[PDB]
């Protein structure tokens, strides 16, 4: 008896399959009201010259390097 079952308390993140156009409306919504679809996030991570739509933080590369070497990660910040 083996059975994979379902995962109930966790959701599986899945990447993008389509290119969504970004307007000034989505930029304004994200920067002011904090509303952003995950397709926007998946789009601004393919191209690293895409500096007019998100601030790229070098903490992400450090965290990726740390997670590839079988380490856990704990992030803390202010409001």
């Amino acid at each position: 008896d083996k059975e994979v079952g379902l995962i109930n308390s966790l959701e599986l993140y899945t990447p993008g399959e389509e290119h969504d156009e970004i307007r000034d409306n989505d930029i304004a919504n994200f920067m002011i009201f904090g509303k952003v679809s995950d397709r926007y996030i998946d789009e601004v991570t393919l191209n690293d010259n895409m500096h007019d739509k998100i601030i790229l933080r070098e903490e992400v590369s450090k965290i990726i390097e740390h997670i590839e070497t079988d380490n856990d990660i704990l992030i803390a910040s202010d409001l």
Binding site: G5, L6, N8, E11
Partner: protein, 237 residues
């Protein structure tokens, strides 16, 4: 619909649906009430499940593979296998749906006086889909396999649903065929047009509800026929 799709999470919807269907199956073996049977046999259909769980493949697959263990009688019921097969049609898993429809056919074969018109309709829909995905001689073979089945299918409400796919066939896969296959589906669409104008539809209330859109479909078929005749060479007109 917004509450179901956005407040009630899908990981609650599938589990609660399994719980309520097991409960409804358990209590019905004493009361034998017809409304409970209708509710149970309606909770199975993929239209309702796709209305409850919008485009969730994993949840639908888990639900359909668990429900056949919830009740031990669906494996002997062809209709469950038809619902399973039609569950995976928009998910382009064509060979597995073919196996499911074959199992449904085998289950229907051992039942006396059991009509297979719905199963034949789904098989013809699978034929049309795999003919859309294919080109050339294989597309013609699948198209003929769809045509004979839709010919033995009587003129009912579900038959007119498959008419729209011939328009896409003429729009996309038409130039890939040779002249013989062109004449083949040319007389096929002429026969379909002739069957569409039969007075059996006019006396039906289901056609009476939607007269405008069936008339528009008939006009579209006539325009397709006219375009076929216009694109014909001058030596065959």
């Amino acid at each position: 619909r917004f509450l179901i799709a956005n407040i009630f999470e899908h990981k609650y919807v599938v589990n609660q649906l399994l719980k309520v269907i097991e409960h409804l199956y358990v209590i019905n073996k004493d009361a034998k009430d017809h409304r409970l049977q209708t509710l149970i046999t309606s909770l199975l259909r993929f239209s309702i499940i796709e209305k409850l769980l919008p485009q969730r493949r994993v949840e639908i697959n888990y639900f359909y593979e668990k429900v056949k263990h919830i009740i031990p009688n669906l494996i002997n019921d062809p209709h469950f296998w038809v619902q399973y097969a039609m569950s995976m049609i928009p998910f382009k898993d064509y060979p597995s749906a073919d196996r499911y429809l074959a199992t449904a056919y085998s289950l229907a074969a051992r039942k006396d006086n059991y009509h297979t018109k719905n199963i034949d309709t789904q098989r013809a829909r699978l034929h049309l889909l795999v003919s859309l995905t294919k080109t050339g001689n294989e597309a013609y073979l699948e198209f003929e396999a769809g045509d004979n089945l839709i010919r033995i299918i009587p003129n009912d409400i579900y038959k007119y649903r498959q008419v729209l796919r011939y328009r896409d066939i003429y729009e996309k896969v038409y130039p890939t065929f040779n002249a013989k296959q062109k004449v083949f589906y040319e007389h096929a669409i002429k026969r379909i047009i002739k069957e569409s104008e039969s007075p059996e539809l006019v006396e039906d209330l289901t056609y009476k509800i939607g007269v405008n859109w069936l008339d528009k479909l008939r006009g579209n078929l006539k325009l397709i026929v006219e375009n076929i005749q216009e694109n014909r060479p001058k030596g065959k007109k």
